[PDB]
Design a protein around this ligand. Sequence first.
Ligand SMILES: Nc1ncnc2c1ncn2[C@@H]1O[C@H](COP(=O)(O)OP(=O)(O)O)[C@@H](O)[C@H]1O
Ligand SMILES: Nc1ncnc2c1ncn2[C@@H]1O[C@H](COP(=O)(O)OP(=O)(O)O)[C@@H](O)[C@H]1O
Ligand SMILES: N=C(N)NCCS(=O)(=O)O
Ligand SMILES: N=C(N)NCCS(=O)(=O)O
Ligand SMILES: [Mg+2]
Ligand SMILES: [Mg+2]
Length: 716
Amino acid sequence: MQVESLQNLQVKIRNDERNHSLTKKYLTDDIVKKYQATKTSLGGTLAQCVNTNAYNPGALLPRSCDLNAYETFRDFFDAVIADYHKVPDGKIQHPKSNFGDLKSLSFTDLNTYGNLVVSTRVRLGRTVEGFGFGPTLTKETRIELENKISTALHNLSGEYEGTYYPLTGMSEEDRIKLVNDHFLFRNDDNVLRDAGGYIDWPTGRGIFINKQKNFLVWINEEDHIRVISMQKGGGLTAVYKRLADAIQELSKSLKFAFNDRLGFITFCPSNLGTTLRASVHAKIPMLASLPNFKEICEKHGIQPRGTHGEHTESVGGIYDLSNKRRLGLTELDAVTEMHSGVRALLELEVMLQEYNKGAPEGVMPVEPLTYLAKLLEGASIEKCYTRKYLTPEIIKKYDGKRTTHGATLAHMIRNGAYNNRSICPRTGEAECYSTFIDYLDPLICDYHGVKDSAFKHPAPTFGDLSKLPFGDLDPTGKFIVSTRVRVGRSVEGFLFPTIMSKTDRIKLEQVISGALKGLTGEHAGTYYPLTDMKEEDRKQLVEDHFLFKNDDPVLRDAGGYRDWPVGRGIFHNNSKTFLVWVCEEDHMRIISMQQGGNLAAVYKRLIEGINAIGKSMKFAHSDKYGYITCCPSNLGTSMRASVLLKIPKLSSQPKKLDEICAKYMLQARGLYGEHTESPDGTYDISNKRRLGLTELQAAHEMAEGVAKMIEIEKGL
Ligand SMILES: Nc1ncnc2c1ncn2[C@@H]1O[C@H](COP(=O)(O)OP(=O)(O)O)[C@@H](O)[C@H]1O
Ligand SMILES: Nc1ncnc2c1ncn2[C@@H]1O[C@H](COP(=O)(O)OP(=O)(O)O)[C@@H](O)[C@H]1O
Ligand SMILES: N=C(N)NCCS(=O)(=O)O
Ligand SMILES: N=C(N)NCCS(=O)(=O)O
Ligand SMILES: [Mg+2]
Ligand SMILES: [Mg+2]
């Protein structure tokens, strides 16, 4: 196989902005210098290994010119393997082959759990010693390999009797039937092609199929052999045993390449070790719809794969589920993990289907309350309001309940269950605060530090915008970078961004963007739908502290990134002193900011903007809780006044900082908001409480708070 010089290949890969491969990562100048003239014992080169990465930016891994590539270019492959298979401290290791004691082995049929499994499949790969892969085979040696393999296949015992169908002179209608029946590989794998997988096609290739049609072998496609066991239903025990017996019989007729570090050698580094992939095709549309679906799979040791294109137009929800691991465990370990992980996922799909029977369409489905309650147990009952008030009495009273429009208690604790460092819930609609009042009301009192709960949250009280109890603090630029004040609002009649539907978002955005487009004067500006905004535009505004971020796991697991990015947007005036996030955590976030410390100018611009917006829609509001929001922490005024405060460096004593914080009902966030760290010792310094006080008071408790936190400056 003739390819470009290794150094050309490295340039192409490196200058390709789209390439994010492990090849790119580890194909270093040192590596290229060390290996550029080196040949394997079968005549292969590192260039032949990485060729495909140069022409397919999407591929994550290299391939191998032949089985000796792993040893000959070890500095390169070990790095790639250690990373991909997540090997601890790069001590790559693989245990001796072990399928288990077949006569005593039994796994429950996977259709026990909701009867969702169309079919079950297990496959292995093997390399035969003394032969190269695509880059280093000749036409005649590939045919010799093919003959050696088919010969051993014909000598297989009774259950494995069948027919070998070479790919050469097989009709295009037989081939296309076999592929759709899930029996045969496809033709169109560009990664494989540019790795040399289709040289001299179709000679030396074929498929073996037994009479029963539940065991089959691919010769010289992606590996020397791919050995496959499969049938309808969820009978994994039978599928596994059939595979294991076949490969043990074949092991006596063929010498398979095996490595003490890497296990069985394969063409792609992804398949080293067991090479074993045990899979089901299962109907799991609700589990598949969850925000953290992939991570839930990963956590159970399972990789999900789509099946899009394998069915008619209206067939959905069918996924390939398999053990993610290959390397550093036995075959028995692998299929056991597959079986435990898939069972758990399938059971979770049954629980979701039961628990969300009858819920509104497009509304996020949720795990059962007692399931999420158990995950929440990894959170601290002293820091986490979400857990502290989720008592056994609460679960008993509220499990099974829905608001009028479908919100549950399970919904609002879900972000906490999956992000145990998070400390507040995220509600689904305004009606949550009455429906689930026994849980939310004492949490609300605790967080906001209500002292006399006999009284209403004050009516909206913004004060006289002409004579304010603060003015320009007027600093230098020594402590305060930028002054900012924001409020959240909800629109009556709409579910919150957590569980609202796509169609809801489209209608909400229309209401709000309409009002925003009509703002005049200092508040006149442009609305930017996230659907039309470029990725470097968006990231600039985010790093400029103007736009909300799109990768917060806590908001993601609460439902807030569903149907992304439909109905999300940023509005701002030309100066960017006034801004509105449409449908992030809340329906609205109305923001005023500028460089400097002039809180009064910032505050005034904010209040004027709120009133103008409020002409076109009714904000959700209660006597007890004031302006209602997604998170209970943002009730009342829903107001957060803040500056980014360079305190070099009271950070030095983060307890002199935490004391000076608890002492004002103020909160410390990172440079880029909550759940971020602070370089520079620069701190997001805001008033903590928003309920049980007016908008003037909230901003004054901040002013006094910062005025004082500053003053412990160069007395230091
Ligand atoms: N559990 C299963 N039941 C039926 N067919 C399957 C199953 N798992 C995989 N397949 C089929 O195998 C073929 C190739 O799948 P692929 O994802 O490349 O798996 P592998 O890498 O193990 O060959 C496709 O037709 C796919 O539908
Ligand atoms: N005083 C400030 N100056 C500049 N940016 C700020 C200030 N306060 C908050 N931000 C930014 O606003 C964004 C929102 O983050 P977050 O902490 O979630 O605040 P909220 O959601 O209450 O608006 C973040 O990028 C944060 O860095
Ligand atoms: N083809 C296999 N075996 N894995 C996919 C890796 S890659 O094509 O993304 O490099
Ligand atoms: N409501 C927001 N964004 N944060 C509350 C604090 S936490 O729940 O994210 O820990
Ligand atoms: Mg495949
Ligand atoms: Mg936020």
